[PDB]
Design a protein around this motif. Structure first.
Motif, PDB file in Angstrom:
ATOM      1  N   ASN A  27       0.839  -1.192   0.000  1.00  0.00           N
ATOM      2  CA  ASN A  27       0.000   0.000   0.000  1.00  0.00           C
ATOM      3  C   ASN A  27       0.875   1.244   0.000  1.00  0.00           C
ATOM      4  OD1 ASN A  27      -2.420   1.516   0.119  1.00  0.00           O
ATOM      5  ND2 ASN A  27      -3.038   0.633   2.088  1.00  0.00           N
ATOM      6  N   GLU A  28       0.260   2.366  -0.339  1.00  0.00           N
ATOM      7  CA  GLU A  28       0.968   3.620  -0.484  1.00  0.00           C
ATOM      8  C   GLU A  28      -0.004   4.722  -0.097  1.00  0.00           C
ATOM      9  OE1 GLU A  28       2.921   4.070  -4.321  1.00  0.00           O
ATOM     10  OE2 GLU A  28       3.443   6.139  -3.921  1.00  0.00           O
ATOM     11  N   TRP A  29       0.538   5.827   0.410  1.00  0.00           N
ATOM     12  CA  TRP A  29      -0.243   6.994   0.808  1.00  0.00           C
ATOM     13  C   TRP A  29       0.370   8.265   0.245  1.00  0.00           C
ATOM     14  CZ3 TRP A  29       0.390   2.571   3.206  1.00  0.00           C
ATOM     15  CH2 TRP A  29      -0.568   2.070   4.082  1.00  0.00           C
ATOM     16  N   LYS A  30      -0.482   9.271   0.113  1.00  0.00           N
ATOM     17  CA  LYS A  30      -0.071  10.671   0.023  1.00  0.00           C
ATOM     18  C   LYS A  30      -0.835  11.458   1.076  1.00  0.00           C
ATOM     19  CE  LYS A  30       0.507  10.125  -4.964  1.00  0.00           C
ATOM     20  NZ  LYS A  30       1.954   9.841  -4.914  1.00  0.00           N
ATOM     21  N   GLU A  56       3.005   9.726 -11.979  1.00  0.00           N
ATOM     22  CA  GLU A  56       2.598   8.618 -11.139  1.00  0.00           C
ATOM     23  C   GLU A  56       1.228   8.124 -11.571  1.00  0.00           C
ATOM     24  OE1 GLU A  56       4.697   7.387  -8.584  1.00  0.00           O
ATOM     25  OE2 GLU A  56       5.950   8.525  -9.940  1.00  0.00           O
ATOM     26  N   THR A  58      -1.931   6.283  -9.397  1.00  0.00           N
ATOM     27  CA  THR A  58      -2.387   5.739  -8.143  1.00  0.00           C
ATOM     28  C   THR A  58      -3.890   5.868  -7.989  1.00  0.00           C
ATOM     29  OG1 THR A  58      -2.103   7.804  -6.865  1.00  0.00           O
ATOM     30  CG2 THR A  58      -0.207   6.305  -6.985  1.00  0.00           C
ATOM     31  N   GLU A  59      -4.457   4.960  -7.211  1.00  0.00           N
ATOM     32  CA  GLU A  59      -5.839   5.140  -6.757  1.00  0.00           C
ATOM     33  C   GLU A  59      -5.955   6.274  -5.733  1.00  0.00           C
ATOM     34  OE1 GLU A  59      -8.563   4.142  -8.023  1.00  0.00           O
ATOM     35  OE2 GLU A  59      -9.958   4.624  -6.401  1.00  0.00           O
ATOM     36  N   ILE A  60      -4.872   6.533  -5.008  1.00  0.00           N
ATOM     37  CA  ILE A  60      -4.778   7.674  -4.103  1.00  0.00           C
ATOM     38  C   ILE A  60      -5.264   8.938  -4.827  1.00  0.00           C
ATOM     39  CG2 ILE A  60      -3.149   9.161  -2.901  1.00  0.00           C
ATOM     40  CD1 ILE A  60      -1.236   6.601  -2.941  1.00  0.00           C
ATOM     41  N   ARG A  63      -8.938   9.091  -6.159  1.00  0.00           N
ATOM     42  CA  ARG A  63      -9.887   9.399  -5.117  1.00  0.00           C
ATOM     43  C   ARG A  63      -9.829  10.860  -4.723  1.00  0.00           C
ATOM     44  NH1 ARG A  63     -12.173   8.765   0.151  1.00  0.00           N
ATOM     45  NH2 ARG A  63     -10.199   8.934   1.307  1.00  0.00           N
ATOM     46  N   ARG A  64      -8.635  11.449  -4.644  1.00  0.00           N
ATOM     47  CA  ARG A  64      -8.554  12.851  -4.271  1.00  0.00           C
ATOM     48  C   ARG A  64      -9.168  13.744  -5.329  1.00  0.00           C
ATOM     49  NH1 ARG A  64      -9.152  16.036  -0.154  1.00  0.00           N
ATOM     50  NH2 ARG A  64      -7.897  17.955  -0.257  1.00  0.00           N
ATOM     51  N   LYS A  67     -12.895  13.573  -4.928  1.00  0.00           N
ATOM     52  CA  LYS A  67     -13.338  14.328  -3.749  1.00  0.00           C
ATOM     53  C   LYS A  67     -13.457  15.806  -4.078  1.00  0.00           C
ATOM     54  CE  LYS A  67     -14.271  15.285   0.616  1.00  0.00           C
ATOM     55  NZ  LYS A  67     -13.244  15.341   1.646  1.00  0.00           N
TER      56      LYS A  67
ATOM     57  N   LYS B  67      11.220   0.611  -7.015  1.00  0.00           N
ATOM     58  CA  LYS B  67      10.539   1.723  -7.698  1.00  0.00           C
ATOM     59  C   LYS B  67      11.572   2.618  -8.362  1.00  0.00           C
ATOM     60  CE  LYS B  67       7.152   4.630  -8.684  1.00  0.00           C
ATOM     61  NZ  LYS B  67       6.693   5.656  -7.804  1.00  0.00           N
TER      62      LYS B  67
ATOM     63  N   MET D  20      -4.718  15.441   4.970  1.00  0.00           N
ATOM     64  CA  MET D  20      -5.709  14.416   4.668  1.00  0.00           C
ATOM     65  C   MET D  20      -4.950  13.309   3.960  1.00  0.00           C
ATOM     66  SD  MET D  20      -8.862  16.768   3.442  1.00  0.00           S
ATOM     67  CE  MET D  20     -10.086  17.333   4.625  1.00  0.00           C
ATOM     68  N   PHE D  21      -4.746  12.179   4.645  1.00  0.00           N
ATOM     69  CA  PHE D  21      -3.923  11.100   4.124  1.00  0.00           C
ATOM     70  C   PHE D  21      -4.849  10.109   3.414  1.00  0.00           C
ATOM     71  CE2 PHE D  21      -0.060  11.823   6.834  1.00  0.00           C
ATOM     72  CZ  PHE D  21      -0.603  12.645   7.787  1.00  0.00           C
ATOM     73  N   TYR D  22      -4.522   9.773   2.172  1.00  0.00           N
ATOM     74  CA  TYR D  22      -5.283   8.817   1.365  1.00  0.00           C
ATOM     75  C   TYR D  22      -4.365   7.666   1.022  1.00  0.00           C
ATOM     76  CZ  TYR D  22      -9.019  12.238   0.086  1.00  0.00           C
ATOM     77  OH  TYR D  22     -10.052  13.132   0.046  1.00  0.00           O
ATOM     78  N   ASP D  23      -4.881   6.440   1.090  1.00  0.00           N
ATOM     79  CA  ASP D  23      -4.166   5.265   0.636  1.00  0.00           C
ATOM     80  C   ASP D  23      -4.763   4.767  -0.682  1.00  0.00           C
ATOM     81  OD1 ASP D  23      -6.492   3.953   1.350  1.00  0.00           O
ATOM     82  OD2 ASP D  23      -5.450   2.253   2.313  1.00  0.00           O
ATOM     83  N   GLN D  24      -4.398   3.540  -1.052  1.00  0.00           N
ATOM     84  CA  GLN D  24      -4.816   2.963  -2.325  1.00  0.00           C
ATOM     85  C   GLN D  24      -6.149   2.246  -2.254  1.00  0.00           C
ATOM     86  OE1 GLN D  24      -3.066   3.914  -4.895  1.00  0.00           O
ATOM     87  NE2 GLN D  24      -1.074   2.881  -5.027  1.00  0.00           N
TER      88      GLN D  24
END
Ligand SMILES: [Cl-]
Ligand SMILES: [Cl-]
Ligand SMILES: [Cl-]
Ligand SMILES: [Cl-]
Ligand SMILES: [Cl-]
Ligand SMILES: [Mg+2]
Ligand SMILES: [Mg+2]
Ligand SMILES: [Mg+2]
Ligand SMILES: [Mg+2]
Lengths: 164, 164, 164, 164
Positions: A27-30, A56, A58-60, A63-64, A67, B67, D20-24
């Protein structure tokens, strides 16, 4: 500020401080900053769409973007200038009518071609000297908001009008 | 700047601010900075391999190394100097041709032996005294990039050449 | 420095910047700093045990304490002064032979009774004025390490001896 | 200070740095600061309820409000002024007896109507100028605690009384 038809932005190092969080499982976050949601607010208030360009994927970020009701999202972009030109063609506009903010090597060619270039204070020196306006904020500190507010000349009168 | 044939780096406190995130389930995170990917870019642009040495052993770091296409990864290393020496033997170079960046006690022996030693600004003073070049950035702020750009003498002309 | 036979420490706001990360599912995180592992290193090098006292109770901290080989861990502590007294009584130790670092209201009673009180630079004013030594570091920046090094008089001679 | 019967607060940009932290996978995080728990402590010590008003709606914040024993929690709030007015009516108090802290556009109307308005140092200029007291701290740095301690005139004597 000149007439802008489209605001384009990178993600990592602009909407974030460059942080890429990895766990042990794939998993990965921003970490985004809610302040940047006001950049979308002001753009839409002025009838201007916003697009994200990122190398990049990402699903991150999907989703953002969802939103914040971002108008366009292009990920896995190998050539940001080309992607911007394709979107300009899609919309019937030209690069002079684009404001773009980015922070690193793969942003440089596009930064040099747009009507208004922005670069966060945290970016490398080589990239900062491409900025056509001074941005005080660092990546992740609300620098996308700062950029939009400067590009669109948001002032106290605009503020007073939206908090009625 | 001296002739360098290999760039080596620690992870925690260099590629990160030392942060180690723990949850309630046994998972763990690190926060990398995308800026440091440019350190790999510039090393590879100059034909120089990069290796990671770390006393930790995590999927976090395995994934990050892959990566970025890092050339060598040694995890669970208790003796960083001996790991560096073995890689030098494999590559037919000597430690004077190595640039190493580290931040703490288990880096000291290697830092004292390499051609160019770098230490982030956030490191303990007795480790910073070992640095042979000054680094302004802290761990996690892009100090691996800073180190590589200094080691390899990256300049505006190099920048101009890579952006078309 | 006066004779210290035990180093005691709070977690949140000392080993961290006070950050408590919550997700949507009931999990929780803390962000530790690897620098603080050196505080355990130096304590153990000098034959001094370390104990954690915290009012919180988490697997996060149990796991961190285990990896770092912390000698004593007390979670869910209602009264830190009592907990310190009870541990010290088992060990034969007087509070004047204890160094304790904490950051907030529930630390004050114990801070006022130990031989060396430490408080991070980030803590509230009313607590900082209880510190009997100056600490420059903030919570999560390696202030537990700073405290240990000051308490035990860790110096360049010690460093030279450990990195030979 | 003015007589206050209710303390109200926003979350993002006050209790957090806006992160606001978002993951995958569709999960989300916020990072709170334990220091802010003392804001609830002091309010309750003085017999004053605390309420949260937020336009977001998350399990993250349900959990934090529960942990801290916050008296009122309103999420998904469309109009923070209206929500505050309704709550004031229920309690039989007026807005002049409310202290409110917020950081952004959707806080402005309420900030302009309350007895004591607070805005973190990290907020936009247009919002900071609405603050009726100066707050040094940024979102996530314990600014809710700072606000409460100022509003309620917490002093050294109050501190001494609680640590007996
Ligand atoms: Cl990119
Ligand atoms: Cl973080
Ligand atoms: Cl290591
Ligand atoms: Cl506690
Ligand atoms: Cl909100
Ligand atoms: Mg970027
Ligand atoms: Mg390290
Ligand atoms: Mg604490
Ligand atoms: Mg807010």
């Amino acid at each position: 500020m000149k007439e802008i038809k489209l605001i384009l932005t990178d993600i990592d190092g602009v909407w974030t401080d460059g942080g890429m969080f990895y766990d042990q499982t794939g998993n990965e976050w921003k970490k985004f900053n809610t302040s940047d949601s006001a950049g979308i607010f002001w753009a839409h208030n002025k009838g201007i769409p916003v697009g994200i360009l990122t190398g990049e994927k990402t699903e991150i970020v999907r989703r953002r973007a969802e939103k914040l009701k971002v108008d366009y999202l292009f990920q896995g972009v190998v050539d940001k200038l080309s992607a911007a030109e394709e979107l300009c063609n899609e919309l019937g506009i030209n690069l002079e009518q684009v404001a773009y903010i980015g922070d690193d090597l793969n942003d440089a060619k596009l930064l040099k071609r747009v009507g208004i270039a922005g670069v966060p204070a945290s970016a490398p020196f080589y990239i900062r000297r491409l900025s056509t306006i001074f941005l005080e904020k660092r990546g992740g500190e609300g620098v996308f908001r700062e950029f939009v507010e400067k590009v669109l000349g948001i002032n106290l009168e605009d503020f007073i009008a939206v908090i009625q």
